[PDB]
Amino acid sequence: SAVQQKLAALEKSSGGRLGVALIDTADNTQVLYRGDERFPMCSTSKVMAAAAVLKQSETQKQLLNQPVEIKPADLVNYNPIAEKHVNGTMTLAELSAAALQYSDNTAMNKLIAQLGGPGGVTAFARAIGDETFRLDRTEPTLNTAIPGDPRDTTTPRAMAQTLRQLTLGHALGETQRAQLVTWLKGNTTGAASIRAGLPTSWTVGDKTGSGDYGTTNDIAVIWPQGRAPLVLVTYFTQPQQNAESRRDVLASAARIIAEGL
Ligand SMILES: *[B@@]1([O])O[C][C]([C][O])O1
């Protein structure tokens, strides 16, 4: 189709490898570009960890208010929010928000610990029907994004389906889903990524990711004003380990998708 030709051209112009999946919930139609190839998730994995904790809170009703101590040894490479609470506590809700809205890596590691390790996050994916997602490592090493390495990867198609289920479907309880949506809509790191390729009037909730090999990712739910929502996953990675981030590619891919509607 037109859109796949334009995405391929965008990819060729970028020098990297682009993966896109769009679900239009109006007719449950799908647009895929490298939709079944694996890509390093980097911080887009934080959505799954937060959702797993939300799922736990359906039974442990007070779980999100549980305080978790932030110690100096907990700090890793990128901890904008946790740093503000060293030698103090954050609740699991605050950690989930920090992981999602600021991409805080310490917060992510606390979420992983709450779930019993990366295998606990992966287990949640399996439990909601995602056979593709795999989380193998903690922060920061899950961002190594080595070409061909299956660790800490998913495919665009899988992640789009899973994001749809978590935010628009009923993989989570009603209060939990609403909370996740609220968190994603309040993301602070996304302005140059999918959001930048979309009409300013559309509401977006997204989670970015970035890693080595110039890996530049964003996953979003999109509420166009007067129109069924869309789920859009854009993954991008490059052949050079030290490549620079290319958020513009994700913006351009979103723009191309939006044109075709
Ligand atoms: B994710 O990908 O978003 C930022 C942090 C940097 O390590 O991880």
Question: What does this protein look like?
Answer:
- The strands form 3 sheets. This protein has a 5-stranded antiparallel beta sheet, sandwiched between helices.
- Helix 1 packs antiparallel against helix 8 (247-259) and helix 2 crosses helix 4 (105-114).
- The protein is α+β, with helices and mostly antiparallel strands.
- The chain contains 8 helices and 9 strands.
- The two termini are 13 Å apart.
- A hairpin with a 4-residue loop joins strand 1 and strand 2.
- The protein has one domain: DD-peptidase/beta-lactamase superfamily (Beta-lactamase), CATH 3.40.710.
- It is globular.
- The protein binds [(4~{S})-2-oxidanyl-1,3,2-dioxaborolan-4-yl]methanol.
- InterPro entries: Beta-lactam/transpept-like, Beta-lactam_cat, Beta-lactam_class-A, Beta-lactam_class-A_AS, Cefotaximase.
- This is Beta-lactamase.
**How many distinct helices?**
8
In quaternary terms, these chains amount to: monomer
Assign a percent range to the helix content.
Answer: 25-40%
CATH class (first level) name: Alpha Beta
CATH level-two architecture: 3-Layer(aba) Sandwich
Number of domains: 1
Apparent shape: globular
